[PDB]
Design an enzyme around this catalytic site. Structure first.
Site, PDB file in Angstrom:
ATOM      1  N   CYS A 273      -3.224   2.083   3.849  1.00 20.45           N
ATOM      2  CA  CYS A 273      -4.708   1.168   4.044  1.00 20.45           C
ATOM      3  C   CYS A 273      -4.557   0.456   5.469  1.00 20.45           C
ATOM      4  CB  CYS A 273      -5.124   0.229   3.129  1.00 20.45           C
ATOM      5  SG  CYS A 273      -6.179  -0.793   3.456  1.00 20.45           S
TER       6      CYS A 273
ATOM      7  N   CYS B 282      -4.988  -3.138   5.800  1.00 23.80           N
ATOM      8  CA  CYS B 282      -4.249  -3.934   4.862  1.00 23.80           C
ATOM      9  C   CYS B 282      -2.943  -4.119   5.393  1.00 23.80           C
ATOM     10  CB  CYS B 282      -4.231  -3.177   3.593  1.00 23.80           C
ATOM     11  SG  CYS B 282      -5.855  -2.828   2.443  1.00 23.80           S
TER      12      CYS B 282
END
Ligand SMILES: [Zn+2]
Length: 145
Positions: free
Chosen positions: A66, A69
């Site tokens: 991600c 992230c």
């Protein structure tokens, strides 16, 4: 006046003065520094006990693979160290912890959520750079309960 905080190592509740002389306080059950500035990785067994803390608690719901992230992680950690005595920084890997992810109805990753005294105060939609993250925290904490 008194407050309760949670030992991030053994989960014990520790009662402390709201106004502290320093941040060297140690867990009464296990000796762990109550304010070590480390990011905490929560699981289905710890999250609810962690939410019993009276300290403000920001939670990063994230996933592997991600991009935002990944870029937020080091920012989350560095902020964590800078606020060891004021705010706790908790992470939940939504893929490790699917039931938690469902229970908190996560609709994007990452999701960054501030909790205070069991209340969900505000959430950020996505990753942000450190300064706007610091600003968001300060603004939300200065908010009236
Ligand atoms: Zn402890």
């Amino acid at each position: 006046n008194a407050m309760n905080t949670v030992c991030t190592a053994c989960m014990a509740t520790n009662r402390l003065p709201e106004e502290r002389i320093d941040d060297g306080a140690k867990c009464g059950r296990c000796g762990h520094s109550l304010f070590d500035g480390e990011v905490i990785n929560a699981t289905a067994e710890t999250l609810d006990k962690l939410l019993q803390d009276d300290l403000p608690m920001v939670i990063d719901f994230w996933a592997p693979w991600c991009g935002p992230c990944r870029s937020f992680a080091p920012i989350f950690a560095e902020t964590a160290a800078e606020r060891a005595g004021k705010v706790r920084f908790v992470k939940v890997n939504t893929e490790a912890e699917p039931a938690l992810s469902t229970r908190f109805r996560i609709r994007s990753i990452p999701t960054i959520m501030l909790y205070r005294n069991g209340k969900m105060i505000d959430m950020l939609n996505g990753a942000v750079p450190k300064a706007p993250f610091d600003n968001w925290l300060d603004e939300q904490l200065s908010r009236d309960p």
